[PDB]
């Protein structure tokens, strides 16, 4: 029932290159829908799902200019951070930013987000009150003061409660069957004779969206983490995901082992075992 929008923004300086590379990716409900890249021939925001082609040229021209402004902002900030951290020239540096908003089922604002990282590390973030800032690093305190002085929190709070909600409402009405979909995991168990006396049961879940999923094993019982290996969830490359979890077992006595697959698309958790 819930929904979100995110812009994920990155600028990267490298030793020789005159200007940094700036990339911005927007997401509705965790699916990419727009992108800008300053390396591109003639950089602009481009649609990244078919449902975004409804927006006319005035939408794209404005978004592109916002992107060019952000790239100017990341450029100056990268420069200022260099000085804040007494870093000299000839290094590589990263600045990243995360977006704005989460709605509940009723489409009202649950939370606003605004976070920045330098060299992949928390630099500064707007707290959930959308009024105060968290900055851990001694160097970050300079930004925190400057931003407290100029009422930056108010600007970002207005975006987060206003445009971010309004435009997410609009986007959700526009791609109504493209993002109101979940694919269920089809699950199966495979068998692998391993050094004698023992064997690995591998529980597979395939073809599912979104990524969040859990695979458990029970020894007829209630729990197994003692040599339960798994893999991190992985993209298949077609928009669906894949995961397995495995458990080591006595050969012969494998018919009392049960795998459970928990996914939001399921009516109830899947249950299956090795089927010879």
């Amino acid at each position: 029932g819930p929904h979100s929008m995110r812009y994920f923004e990155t600028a990267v300086s490298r030793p020789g290159l005159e200007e940094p590379r700036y990339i911005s990716v927007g997401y509705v409900d965790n699916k990419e829908f727009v992108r800008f890249d300053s390396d591109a021939e003639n950089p602009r925001y481009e649609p990244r799902a078919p449902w975004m082609e409804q927006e006319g040229p005035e939408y794209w021209e404005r978004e592109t200019q916002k992107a060019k402004g952000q790239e100017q902002w990341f450029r100056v900030s990268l420069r200022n951070l260099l000085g804040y951290y007494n870093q000299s020239a000839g290094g590589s540096h990263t600045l990243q930013q995360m977006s704005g908003c989460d709605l509940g089922s009723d489409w009202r604002l649950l939370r606003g987000y605004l976070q920045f990282a330098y060299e992949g590390r928390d630099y500064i973030a707007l707290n959930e009150d959308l009024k105060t800032w968290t900055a851990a690093d001694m160097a970050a305190q300079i930004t925190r003061r400057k931003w407290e002085q100029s009422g930056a929190a108010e600007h970002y709070k207005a975006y987060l409660e206003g445009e971010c909600v309004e435009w997410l409402h609009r986007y959700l009405k526009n791609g109504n069957a493209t993002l109101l979909r979940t694919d269920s995991p089809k699950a199966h168990v495979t068998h692998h004779p391993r050094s004698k006396g023992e064997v690995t049961l591998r529980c597979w879940a395939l073809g599912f969206y979104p990524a969040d999923i859990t695979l458990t094993w029970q020894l007829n019982g209630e729990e197994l983490t003692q040599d339960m290996e798994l893999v991190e969830t992985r993209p298949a490359g077609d928009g669906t995901f894949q995961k397995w979890a495995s458990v080591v077992v006595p050969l012969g006595k494998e018919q009392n082992y049960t795998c459970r697959v928990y996914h939001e698309g399921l009516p109830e958790p899947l249950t299956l075992r090795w089927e010879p």
Binding site: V76, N80, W147, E166
Partner: peptide, 9 residues
């Protein structure tokens, strides 16, 4: 709809 940032760092 993209955010524009306020003051630089």
């Amino acid at each position: 709809k993209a955010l524009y940032n306020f003051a630089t760092m």
